[PDB]
Design an enzyme around this catalytic site. Sequence first.
Site, PDB file in Angstrom:
ATOM      1  N   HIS B  75       0.848  -1.187   0.000  1.00 42.56           N
ATOM      2  CA  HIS B  75       0.000   0.000   0.000  1.00 42.56           C
ATOM      3  C   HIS B  75       0.894   1.251   0.000  1.00 42.56           C
ATOM      4  O   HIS B  75       0.603   2.213  -0.713  1.00 42.56           O
ATOM      5  CB  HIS B  75      -0.865   0.029   1.217  1.00 42.56           C
ATOM      6  CG  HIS B  75      -2.056  -0.866   1.099  1.00 42.56           C
ATOM      7  ND1 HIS B  75      -2.957  -1.057   2.114  1.00 42.56           N
ATOM      8  CD2 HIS B  75      -2.543  -1.562   0.045  1.00 42.56           C
ATOM      9  CE1 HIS B  75      -3.982  -1.778   1.687  1.00 42.56           C
ATOM     10  NE2 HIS B  75      -3.749  -2.097   0.429  1.00 42.56           N
ATOM     11  N   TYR B  85      -9.543   4.988   2.367  1.00 43.49           N
ATOM     12  CA  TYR B  85     -10.243   3.944   3.126  1.00 43.49           C
ATOM     13  C   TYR B  85     -11.764   3.979   3.096  1.00 43.49           C
ATOM     14  O   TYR B  85     -12.441   2.997   2.818  1.00 43.49           O
ATOM     15  CB  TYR B  85      -9.583   3.697   4.503  1.00 43.49           C
ATOM     16  CG  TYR B  85      -8.272   2.927   4.392  1.00 43.49           C
ATOM     17  CD1 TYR B  85      -7.064   3.571   4.119  1.00 43.49           C
ATOM     18  CD2 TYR B  85      -8.252   1.526   4.420  1.00 43.49           C
ATOM     19  CE1 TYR B  85      -5.862   2.862   3.946  1.00 43.49           C
ATOM     20  CE2 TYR B  85      -7.034   0.801   4.299  1.00 43.49           C
ATOM     21  CZ  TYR B  85      -5.872   1.477   4.025  1.00 43.49           C
ATOM     22  OH  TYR B  85      -4.735   0.745   3.831  1.00 43.49           O
ATOM     23  N   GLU B 127       0.396   1.863   8.170  1.00 48.72           N
ATOM     24  CA  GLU B 127       0.949   2.561   7.024  1.00 48.72           C
ATOM     25  C   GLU B 127       1.500   3.956   7.390  1.00 48.72           C
ATOM     26  O   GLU B 127       2.573   4.348   6.903  1.00 48.72           O
ATOM     27  CB  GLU B 127      -0.141   2.651   5.951  1.00 48.72           C
ATOM     28  CG  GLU B 127      -0.235   1.249   5.300  1.00 48.72           C
ATOM     29  CD  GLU B 127      -1.552   1.003   4.601  1.00 48.72           C
ATOM     30  OE1 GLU B 127      -2.388   1.906   4.450  1.00 48.72           O
ATOM     31  OE2 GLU B 127      -1.853  -0.154   4.313  1.00 48.72           O
TER      32      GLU B 127
HETATM   33  C1  HEM Z   1      -8.638  -2.779   4.954  1.00 54.35           C
HETATM   34  C2  HEM Z   1      -8.813  -2.511   3.661  1.00 54.35           C
HETATM   35  C3  HEM Z   1      -7.871  -3.188   2.638  1.00 54.35           C
HETATM   36  C4  HEM Z   1      -7.479  -4.463   2.536  1.00 54.35           C
HETATM   37  C5  HEM Z   1      -7.863  -5.657   3.438  1.00 54.35           C
HETATM   38  C6  HEM Z   1      -6.622  -4.556   1.379  1.00 54.35           C
HETATM   39  C7  HEM Z   1      -6.127  -5.731   0.851  1.00 54.35           C
HETATM   40  C8  HEM Z   1      -5.292  -5.840  -0.239  1.00 54.35           C
HETATM   41  C9  HEM Z   1      -4.699  -7.061  -0.743  1.00 54.35           C
HETATM   42  C10 HEM Z   1      -4.896  -8.455  -0.098  1.00 54.35           C
HETATM   43  C11 HEM Z   1      -3.874  -6.705  -1.724  1.00 54.35           C
HETATM   44  C12 HEM Z   1      -2.939  -7.559  -2.594  1.00 54.35           C
HETATM   45  C13 HEM Z   1      -1.561  -7.848  -1.945  1.00 54.35           C
HETATM   46  C14 HEM Z   1      -0.645  -8.799  -2.684  1.00 54.35           C
HETATM   47  O1  HEM Z   1      -1.019 -10.009  -2.817  1.00 54.35           O
HETATM   48  O2  HEM Z   1       0.446  -8.285  -3.050  1.00 54.35           O
HETATM   49  C15 HEM Z   1      -3.957  -5.282  -1.936  1.00 54.35           C
HETATM   50  C16 HEM Z   1      -3.257  -4.539  -2.865  1.00 54.35           C
HETATM   51  C17 HEM Z   1      -3.586  -3.230  -3.171  1.00 54.35           C
HETATM   52  N1  HEM Z   1      -4.486  -2.438  -2.467  1.00 54.35           N
HETATM   53 FE1  HEM Z   1      -5.296  -2.826  -0.730  1.00 54.35          FE
HETATM   54  N2  HEM Z   1      -6.502  -3.320   0.731  1.00 54.35           N
HETATM   55  C18 HEM Z   1      -7.279  -2.496   1.530  1.00 54.35           C
HETATM   56  C19 HEM Z   1      -7.515  -1.164   1.295  1.00 54.35           C
HETATM   57  C20 HEM Z   1      -7.082  -0.530   0.153  1.00 54.35           C
HETATM   58  C21 HEM Z   1      -7.381   0.869  -0.171  1.00 54.35           C
HETATM   59  C22 HEM Z   1      -8.180   1.751   0.796  1.00 54.35           C
HETATM   60  C23 HEM Z   1      -6.818   1.184  -1.337  1.00 54.35           C
HETATM   61  C24 HEM Z   1      -6.838   2.560  -2.076  1.00 54.35           C
HETATM   62  C25 HEM Z   1      -7.173   2.645  -3.368  1.00 54.35           C
HETATM   63  C26 HEM Z   1      -6.108  -0.032  -1.746  1.00 54.35           C
HETATM   64  C27 HEM Z   1      -5.356  -0.149  -2.899  1.00 54.35           C
HETATM   65  C28 HEM Z   1      -4.595  -1.255  -3.213  1.00 54.35           C
HETATM   66  C29 HEM Z   1      -3.691  -1.291  -4.337  1.00 54.35           C
HETATM   67  C30 HEM Z   1      -3.396  -0.113  -5.296  1.00 54.35           C
HETATM   68  C31 HEM Z   1      -3.110  -2.480  -4.320  1.00 54.35           C
HETATM   69  C32 HEM Z   1      -2.040  -3.001  -5.299  1.00 54.35           C
HETATM   70  C33 HEM Z   1      -0.557  -2.964  -4.878  1.00 54.35           C
HETATM   71  C34 HEM Z   1       0.463  -3.341  -5.923  1.00 54.35           C
HETATM   72  O3  HEM Z   1       0.486  -4.555  -6.278  1.00 54.35           O
HETATM   73  O4  HEM Z   1       1.254  -2.424  -6.293  1.00 54.35           O
HETATM   74  N3  HEM Z   1      -6.310  -1.078  -0.832  1.00 54.35           N
HETATM   75  N4  HEM Z   1      -4.845  -4.792  -1.014  1.00 54.35           N
END
Ligand code: HEM
Lengths: 135, 135
Positions: B75, B85, B127
């Site tokens: 993130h 969020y 974060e």
């Molecule tokens: C509690 C809330 C959240 C959870 C549980 C969560 C969960 C996850 C998970 C499981 C992944 C993939 C990780 C991997 O296998 O590498 C991920 C990636 C990502 N999440 Fe979150 N996320 C949350 C909130 C957010 C929010 C608020 C945003 C804003 C837009 C966000 C944006 C992203 C992005 C951009 C990625 C891609 C990262 C990359 O591969 O460069 N997520 N998230």
Amino acid sequence: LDQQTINIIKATVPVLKEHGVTITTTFYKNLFAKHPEVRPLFQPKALAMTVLAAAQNIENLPAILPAVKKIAVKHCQAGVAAAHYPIVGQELLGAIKEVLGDAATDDILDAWGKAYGVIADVFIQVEADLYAQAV
Amino acid sequence: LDQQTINIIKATVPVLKEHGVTITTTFYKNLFAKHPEVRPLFQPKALAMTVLAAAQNIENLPAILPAVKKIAVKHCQAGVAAAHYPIVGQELLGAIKEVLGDAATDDILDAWGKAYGVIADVFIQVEADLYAQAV
Ligand code: HEM
Ligand code: HEM
């Protein structure tokens, strides 16, 4: 985890902090006298005050993670076990009761026990994870 | 943070998990359609299911730390902000509502929003600390 409990911690921490020296010294004196078996693991004068500080941030425990993580490594290096937690909690509550005197109501004590339980859990988990990451 | 919420969380996750594919797909469709500004940050198919997984361990969040920490770094590399969020939360609840249909009472939805706020708070703090450590 209950809001009343939380309210009582918030209300009483400041009172306990005003008597920090006594809580700290009473706690160590009792811990060592009553539990000679932990003496080999050892004084970190801040142990008790750190609990109070964690309690003061009970609604935002995540904010104390960086400190929790550094202490956790020291605990894992020393051989601290999940079974040690209750013993330290017991001696802390005893120190708290001594300081509170009359004002030590059963509801306040119970609050502090609940609070300690929660804080102890974070340490226990983080540490279980470090011991596991060790292999 | 209350028992009923927790009860509601424990009773319905299993039902949500059963319709995972729908929740995941509906969430992504609406997120991107309604908030084009986040599109440049990106699909992690497991985003929504991971929240469900945290919810089910809501009484023991520390145990999910090792996962939370690996995601948090991703993130922070991407520029995720505390302000994102609520938007993700809004779209998740919308997905959950769709799936629950008739059973989607106001108290159920309110519980899930609560649950989500708590989980979101852990990632935000973790974060914020990483971003701060970066300098
Ligand atoms: C509690 C809330 C959240 C959870 C549980 C969560 C969960 C996850 C998970 C499981 C992944 C993939 C990780 C991997 O296998 O590498 C991920 C990636 C990502 N999440 Fe979150 N996320 C949350 C909130 C957010 C929010 C608020 C945003 C804003 C837009 C966000 C944006 C992203 C992005 C951009 C990625 C891609 C990262 C990359 O591969 O460069 N997520 N998230
Ligand atoms: C939630 C409860 C606890 C808190 C907040 C806590 C806090 C602390 C603090 C702040 C330190 C000093 C860290 C430093 O400046 O290096 C410390 C060290 C230590 N604690 Fe804990 N402690 C807790 C529970 C325990 C338990 C249950 C035991 C078991 C006997 C224990 C045994 C130790 C020992 C042996 C050290 C010394 C580490 C060293 O210097 O090698 N603590 N603790």
